[PDB]
Amino acid sequence: TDNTFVSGNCDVVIGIVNNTVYDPLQPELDS
């Protein structure tokens, strides 16, 4: 999430691909 920005939806961009975007706040939830 720090290296990318969320804009629009996935049905707009032409050629978009699916991949897992790492979120650094998720593993911190266990604290």
CA separation for the pair 10, 19 (Å, rounded): 12
Going by C-alpha positions, the residue among 12, 30, 14, 28 that lies closest to residue 1 is 28
Binding mask 1-31 for a copy of itself (x = CB under 8 A): ------------------------x--xx-x
Tokens of 9: 């939806």
Distance in Å, CB of 13 to a copy of itself, minimum: 22
The structure tokens 């032409």 sit at: 14
Of 11 and 28, which CB lies nearer to a copy of itself in the complex structure? Answer: 28
Residues at the interface with a copy of itself (CB under 8 A): 25, 28-29, 31
